[PDB]
Design a binder for this molecule. Structure first.
Ligand SMILES: C=C(C(=O)O)[C@@H](C)[C@H]1OB(O)c2cc(F)ccc21
Length: 241
């Protein structure tokens, strides 16, 4: 691991504090601006939609990426949640109530066994089966997110190849002729410290760069900084133009 404190400039530019962790897959080398915070374990919030999706698909709770999960008719504050979703749109709009229902169907015994099989964070699902990743016991660090994502990239998690391919499709965030980003955002507001996450990877022609960042997020106004700050680091490191 190498520490690169120069990336703190990108946080300071926005009156923010946080960590970005990068992993160069070809070279098996990691870089971060803060070795301590890189290994600090936090609630995953909606980054948990990655493992939750994989488990739901492997147990048949989700049949495929086209299956429609009808809105339950309860009007919630995020307007895009107040409609029917499939796996692609539920990931895109981070539709908590869809994933809460998945978790109830999975159940606590299978959820716990799956997170142990995935070596996921502290493997502790204490709390409500349908909210432990928001206000229960599960904690994961940025470097732990990378370990998990590397297994997903290589189809090495303890679920089917199909489930892993479908979730990677559903993680698609950005693509152009220079790179592909597959990732998931998170926003942990229920338990201090309030933080934002962005975790995933950048596919290049001849390498993949895994990333996991989190940052203090005292209000929702800064959510776009999750991606912006990460992209400043990726640009500095010549991973994206
Ligand atoms: C869209 C989001 C994101 O891009 O983060 C957020 C708002 C969403 O996704 B999660 O992180 C999560 C958790 C909650 F308890 C409530 C809402 C969300």
């Amino acid at each position: 691991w190498q520490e690169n404190k120069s990336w703190n400039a990108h946080f300071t530019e926005h009156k923010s504090q946080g960590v970005v962790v990068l992993w160069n897959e070809n070279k098996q080398q990691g870089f971060t601006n803060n070795l301590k915070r890189a290994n600090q374990a936090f609630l995953p919030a909606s980054t948990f939609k990655i493992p939750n999706s994989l488990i739901a698909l492997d147990l048949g709770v989700v049949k495929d990426e086209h299956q429609v999960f009808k809105w339950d008719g309860q009007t919630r504050d995020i307007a895009t949640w107040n409609r029917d979703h499939n796996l692609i749109t539920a990931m895109k709009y981070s539709v908590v109530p869809v994933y809460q229902e998945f978790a109830r169907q999975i159940g606590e015994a299978r959820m716990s066994k799956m997170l142990h099989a995935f070596d996921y964070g502290n493997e502790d699902i204490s709390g409500n089966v349908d909210s432990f990743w928001l206000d229960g016991g599960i904690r994961i660090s940025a470097t732990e997110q990378i370990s998990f994502l590397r297994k997903l990239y290589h189809n090495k998690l303890h679920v089917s190849e199909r489930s892993q391919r479908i979730v990677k499709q559903a993680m698609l965030t950005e693509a152009n002729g220079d790179y592909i980003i597959r990732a998931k955002t998170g926003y942990s507001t229920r338990i201090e410290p309030k933080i934002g996450w962005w975790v995933g990877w950048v596919e290049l022609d001849d390498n993949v760069w895994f990333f996991a960042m989190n940052m203090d997020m005292p209000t929702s106004d800064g959510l776009g900084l999750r991606q912006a700050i990460t992209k400043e680091v990726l640009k500095q490191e010549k991973i994206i133009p």
